Amino acid sequence: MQIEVTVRNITPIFSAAPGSNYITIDGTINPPPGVSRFPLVRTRMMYVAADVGDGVIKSVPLQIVPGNTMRSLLRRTMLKHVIEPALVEKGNKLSIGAYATAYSGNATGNPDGVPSSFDEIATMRAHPFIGLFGGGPRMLEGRLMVDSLYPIHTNAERILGAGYENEMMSGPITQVVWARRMDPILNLGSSEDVEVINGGAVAANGWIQDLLANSKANGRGLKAFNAHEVVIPGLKWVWRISLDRPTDAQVGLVLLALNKMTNERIAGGHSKDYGRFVIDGVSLNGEQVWSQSGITGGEQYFDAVAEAIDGLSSKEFEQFAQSA
Amino acid sequence: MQIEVTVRNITPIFSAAPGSNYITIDGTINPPPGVSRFPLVRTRMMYVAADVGDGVIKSVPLQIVPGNTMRSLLRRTMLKHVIEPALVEKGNKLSIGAYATAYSGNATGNPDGVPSSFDEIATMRAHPFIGLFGGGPRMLEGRLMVDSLYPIHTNAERILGAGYENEMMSGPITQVVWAFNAHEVVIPGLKWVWRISLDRPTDAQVGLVLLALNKMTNERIAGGHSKDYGRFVIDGVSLNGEQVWSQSGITGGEQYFDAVAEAIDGLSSKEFEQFAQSAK
Amino acid sequence: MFVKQVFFDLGARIHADEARALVAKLLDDTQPGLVSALMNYMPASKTSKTEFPLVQFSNFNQGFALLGFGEVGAQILSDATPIIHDAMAKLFASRGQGVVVQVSSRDVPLSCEKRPYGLQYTVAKMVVQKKHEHRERLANPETGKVFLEGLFLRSLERQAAAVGMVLPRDLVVSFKGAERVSSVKLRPDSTLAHGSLRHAVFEVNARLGGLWSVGFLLSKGFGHINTDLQLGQG
């Protein structure tokens, strides 16, 4: 079962690529030393083979949001607005391990050596939340295959073989966004502002001297300057959600998580409002089901997840999490 | 609550973008040779995917105020308008570290890698201001989300396509005001869209956002105070997709205001101290 | 090498010379040696050094600035800044409600290279006349022009040699004109005054890329402006 979630990003997308990268005042990502490099955390990039010129395929950059990131995102919306309301309406109580395994695939960092008995595999695989995301102490396989967010871009013409041939962006899709820290005690100005600090003006003054003693001279003070590379907004992305012999309840759960997908953020940089997005279209095995009012279609999936929400107990999450 | 406000600038707005840019004259903005250079300070420009070319989507240069600037602007407006005057009486005088944590993110740099206990996170994110603006030493998630200021532009119409069929802007969006060094600035007389969003809010938090929004027309956004730039007014605050603004102010959403007012009465210094101490 | 500027804001404007007098009078009872370092006194006596002043006080729109030239002068500012800040803090907390004193710091490198075209550099409040012979040169424009030429040049070479960097010795300067003529008093309510030029314009073929102080009474805060700020700027 194949799902293709085509979205447009309202705010810019920052999913931080690990790597202490550096930036100058105008471009030159990771310059040579002595040009006064500034710290730079770039957005997550996937190298991708692409048709660069006629007959030549090169490994080129393309900035993505990771499939692991949005696997955990889909699992998170699934659990916060469907699963947790079900377990509050029936009063079912999860354990610490059951909660942590339902959100993270494991209760501890040690998976168990034994494999689960086949009845437990069949019952858990049949269960929609467990089937979509496996794991646990006995390392269950899940039915969900969450692919990364590629933009609809020339670097992904080799990726989008079927469909999405139009709406192709030629140029780069990143902008460097600069954030500075400022010290408020440097910027306060007035003593009527410092009448709310206990200790008066002399305490604020003494902190100014601490920072002056740091300015002459490794406890970090304040007032840093940073840049972070972001993916530019308004561009169409594609999400691929593949399923592995799914029950109708698992697909209905995915569509239940998918309808509210917009409230959440496909990114990091929470405070900067990075990750806001609107779903342009959703296709089940290629068929378009998406409307402005969520998903229009797939009624057997919605009915199956309706009957699977009912009778969903905590004990499924408890038994799977419990280590041998 | 996905709060959205339109703000129209009445003076130029100059959110000075970092860059070593130089200008000669209005004909050429960045000269290839070194003839008659004059140092140029760009304000914020955000590249955007837009429909230029009648069907194809291309990155389009656009000019904004960053959401981190306006995040601190919201911070200072509520802190310097609501938190400070409600906080100054009944004692409850803030620590200077709690000050620095209120207006910046943290009190210091190098925040401690030990996380905070859940009771800490539960009562900080239930505080109207502390949970809005997270961080501190143990690095709280802030429920409040602040957008960048997009001018209501045909280059940004893919961002704001639903509610705005008309009042679209096309043509030039800047002009270089000289004073020698010349600063390229956004033209006065723009409608802008600001999106404030909140995930799982207590009513006092969004009430603080509304109290802050009411007194937002005092402070200048992205503006040199020497140049008196960034003056603006507010029309069109839509709360949850519904229009809750007038000339006198909000005139609606009285439960959020009632909750924030009770919350303001209950404001305490002790939760500021527990937000700001570095439990290293 | 580099020159350090440290800026102190008392909430009100204080002139550089009376700030120098105030800094002298504030820490006189205790911490005398730091004062000797700040004011370029002799190590043994109270009188000042005849060489270039590594540490010179300067104007600030909300108070006073300190300029330290070279590694030694920058170190003098580095060891002097917090004690000086603490002194104005206790002085301005003793009277009134109190004010909060805010600072800034900046390490500007100095540089020069010769260019085959003249460059317009203006200066403000630069002293020029100190003796009766200097008055006699100032009466006639022909003999006053070459005196101002030599004065501007020898000030450039002096602060070069003092900062520890080499200047090309083929520079040709020129003086166009000054807007006003005014006197400078060493101490208030003294009959002795010294002549000075206001908004003088000089033209040098080379470029200057740092803080460059010209003429007499440099530690009092006269005749220095930042050559980086004027550069390509009107």
Interchain contact, B110 vs A220, CB within 8 Å: yes
Tokens 């997308």, residue?
A13
Interchain contact, A186 vs C102, CB within 8 Å: yes
- State the alpha helices, DSSP H only, in chain B: 67-78, 84-88, 96-103, 118-124, 203-214, 254-265, 270-276
Interface test with C, best of B21, B23, B99, B181 (most C CBs within 10 A): B181
Q: A223: distance to nearest CA of chain B, Å?
A: 9
Q: Please provide the distance, in angstroms rounded to a whole number, between the alpha carbons at the two ends of chain C.
A: 27
Interchain contact, B96 vs A12, CB within 8 Å: no
Resolution (A): 3.7
Residues in chain C: 234
Secondary structure (DSSP) of B218-266:
TSPSS--TTTT---EEEEEEEETTEE---SS-----HHHHHHHHHHHHT
How far, in Å, CA of B279 to CA of B136, rounded? 10
Residues near C21 by beta carbon (within 8 Å), at least 6 away in sequence: none
How far, in Å, CA of C149 to CA of C152, rounded? 5
Secondary structure (DSSP) of B104-154:
SSSSSSS--SSPPPHHHHHHHTTSTTTTTS-BTTTTBPPSEEE--BEESBT
Q: A292: distance to nearest CA of chain C, Å?
A: 54
List of chain C residues whose C-beta atoms are within 8 Å of the C-beta of residue A200: 93, 98
List of chain C residues whose C-beta atoms are within 8 Å of the C-beta of residue A201: 89, 93, 98-100
Tokens for B159, please give them. Answer: 């961002």
Tokens for C81, please give them. Answer: 């800044």
List of chain C residues whose C-beta atoms are within 8 Å of the C-beta of residue B39: 232-233
List of chain A residues whose C-beta atoms are within 8 Å of the C-beta of residue C101: 205, 208
Tokens for A115, please give them. Answer: 């494999």
Beta strand A38-41 with A225-231 is parallel
How far, in Å, CA of A234 to CA of A11, rounded? 7
Q: Are B208 and B132 in contact (CB under 8 A)?
A: yes
Interchain contact, A220 vs B108, CB within 8 Å: yes
Q: Are C219 and C56 in contact (CB under 8 A)?
A: yes
Please state, as a whole number, how many other Cβ atoms lie within 10 Å of the Cβ of residue C160: 18
How far, in Å, CA of B210 to CA of B3, rounded? 9
Nearest to B173 by CA among B147, B157, B153, B193: B153
Interchain contact, B59 vs A171, CB within 8 Å: yes
Tokens 């969900």, residue?
A144
Name the residue of chain B whose CA is nearest to A24's CA: B19
The phi and psi torsions of A127 (rounded to 5 degrees) equal -60, 135
Nearest to A186 by CA among B104, B136, C15: B104
Nearest to B210 by CA among B241, B247, B271, B254: B254
Question: What technique was this entry resolved by?
Answer: cryo-EM
How far, in Å, CA of C34 to CA of A102, rounded? 66
How far, in Å, CA of A68 to CA of A261, rounded? 16
Q: Are C119 and C175 in contact (CB under 8 A)?
A: no
Nearest to B72 by CA among B201, B227, B216: B216
Q: How many helices (H) and strands (E) does chain B have?
A: 7, 12
Interchain contact, B46 vs A272, CB within 8 Å: no
How far, in Å, CA of C44 to CA of A27, rounded? 54
How far, in Å, CA of A136 to CA of A97, rounded? 9
Out of A188, A189, A201, whose CB is closest to C93? A201
- Interface chains of chain C (3 or more CB pairs under 8 Å): A, B
Buried b (16+ CB within 10 A) or exposed e, A15-31: bebeeebbbbeeeeeee
One-letter amino acid at B187 equals: I
How far, in Å, CA of B198 to CA of B209, rounded? 10
User: Number of Cβ pairs closer than 8 Å across B and C?
Assistant: 10
Q: At what angle do helices B67-78 and B96-103 cross, to 10 degrees?
A: 140
How far, in Å, CA of A166 to CA of A29, rounded? 31
Q: B206 pairs with which residues across the strands?
A: none
The CA R_g of chain B, rounded to the nearest whole Å, is 21
Interchain contact, A273 vs B141, CB within 8 Å: no
How far, in Å, CA of A273 to CA of B196, rounded? 8
Nearest to B134 by CA among B109, B104, B114, B95: B104
